Amino acid sequence: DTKEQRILRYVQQNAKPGDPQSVLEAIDTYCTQKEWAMNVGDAKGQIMDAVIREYSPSLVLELGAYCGYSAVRMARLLQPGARLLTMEINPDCAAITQQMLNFAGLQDKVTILNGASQDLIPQLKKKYDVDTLDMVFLDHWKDRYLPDTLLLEKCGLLRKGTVLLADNVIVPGTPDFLAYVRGSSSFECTHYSSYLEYMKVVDGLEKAIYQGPS
Ligand SMILES: Nc1ncnc2c1ncn2[C@@H]1O[C@H](CSCC[C@H](N)C(=O)O)[C@@H](O)[C@H]1O
Ligand SMILES: O=c1[nH]cnc2c(O)cc(Br)cc12
Ligand SMILES: [Mg+2]
């Protein structure tokens, strides 16, 4: 029994099938109250929703799927015809993500790629019929943000206007990626300040009153 399985089960037992909003809400409740988990979460998710509504992307690539929270969040806003491709290195997570999408009724819009992004990115055009990407959600591991950006560029997957959206640029932080994109004439950057997901961290005091020795 893993934390990721407990999340899926919680969703299966509490969310309305075919209702992506109820799916997102069940995950957020479990991870707020029961177990912290690295889903993008609702505060940042609202920002993502606003950005997606702005750009109405037809083809989105996610780096890092986890339990499928952000894939559900994004795919529920996609127009008919539009596709999300999500890359996930951990097979247990790729399976959980698939079941989450199934439950939400979003499986037809989303394709899960099993593997490391750095290995999968060069396979995109040939194996998944991709010309250029309209949007990229970076949310896998901090050290890969900058090299995967350079790989997307090398492989011709970026066009003028492609929107990169990166999570966690402050915590855990992606200083190299930020420096690079902010300093590069190839990228126009905007920062959206928010809060790390699920940070009502429970702690307590113990009072222990000495009664004497035995
Ligand atoms: N190089 C890589 N390629 C693909 N997936 C990776 C990777 N490095 C880490 N990951 C995966 O990236 C994920 C980070 S957590 C993803 C959270 C998700 N976007 C959400 O908001 O719901 C983990 O599942 C991890 O296994
Ligand atoms: O490693 C992570 N990958 C993707 N997202 C993350 C997050 O949102 C918070 C923390 Br802490 C870690 C990660
Ligand atoms: Mg994140």
Resolution for the entry shown, Å:
1.4
Ligand 2 atom nearest to CA at 64:
4
Catalytic residue among 62, 88, 142, 148: 142
What distance in Å separates the CA atoms of residue 187 and residue 14, rounded to the nearest whole number?
42
Catalytic residue among 139, 154, 160, 206: 139
Minimal-distance CA residue to ligand 2 atom 10: 38
Taking CB atoms within 8 Å and a gap of at least 24, the contacts of 142-148 are: 142/168, 142/172, 142/173, 142/174, 142/177, 144/63, 144/117, 144/118, 145/174, 145/176, 145/177, 146/174, 146/176, 146/177, 146/180, 147/118, 148/63, 148/117, 148/118, 148/121
- Give, for ligand 2, the residue of 167, 198, 201 to mutate: max count of ligand atoms closer than 8 Å to Cβ: 167
- CB of 115 closer than 8 Å to CB of 83: no
Number of Cβ atoms within 10 Å of the Cβ of 99: 17
Question: Which residues have C-beta within 8 Å of that of residue 40, sequence separation ≥ 6?
Answer: 48, 69, 70, 73, 139, 167, 197
**Determination approach:** X-ray
- CB of 129 closer than 8 Å to CB of 109: no
168 is catalytic: yes
Catalytic residue among 168, 176, 200, 203: 168
Buried b (16+ CB within 10 A) or exposed e, 45-66: beebeebbeeeebebbbbbbbb
| Three-class DSSP labels, the chain | CCHHHHHHHHHHHHCCCCCHHHHHHHHHHHHHHCCCCCCCHHHHHHHHHHHHHHHCCCEEEEECCCCCHHHHHHHCCCCCCCEEEEEECCHHHHHHHHHHHHHHCCCCCEEEEECCHHHHHHHHHHHHCCCCCCEEEECCCHHHHHHHHHHHHHCCCCCCCCEEEECCHHHHHCHHHHHHHHHCCCCCCCCCCCCCCCCCCCCCCCCCCCCCCC
Amino acid at 53: R
What distance in Å separates the CA atoms of residue 57 and residue 55, rounded to the nearest whole number?
6
139 is catalytic: yes
- Counting ligands in written order, which one lies closest to the CA of residue 167? 3
Instruction: Give, to the nearest 10 degrees, the angle between helix 175-183 and helix 145-154.
Output: 40
Residues touching ligand 2 (Cβ under 6 Å) are 38, 64, 139-141, 167-168, 172, 197
Report CA(214)–ligand 2 centroid distance (Å).
49
Question: Which residues have C-beta within 8 Å of that of residue 74, sequence separation ≥ 6?
Answer: 48, 52, 60, 62, 84, 137
Q: What is the CATH number of domain 1-201?
A: 3.40.50.150
Q: Which residues pair with 110 in a beta bridge?
A: 84
167 is catalytic: yes
Burial class (CB in 10 A: 0-12, 13-18, 19+), 200: exposed
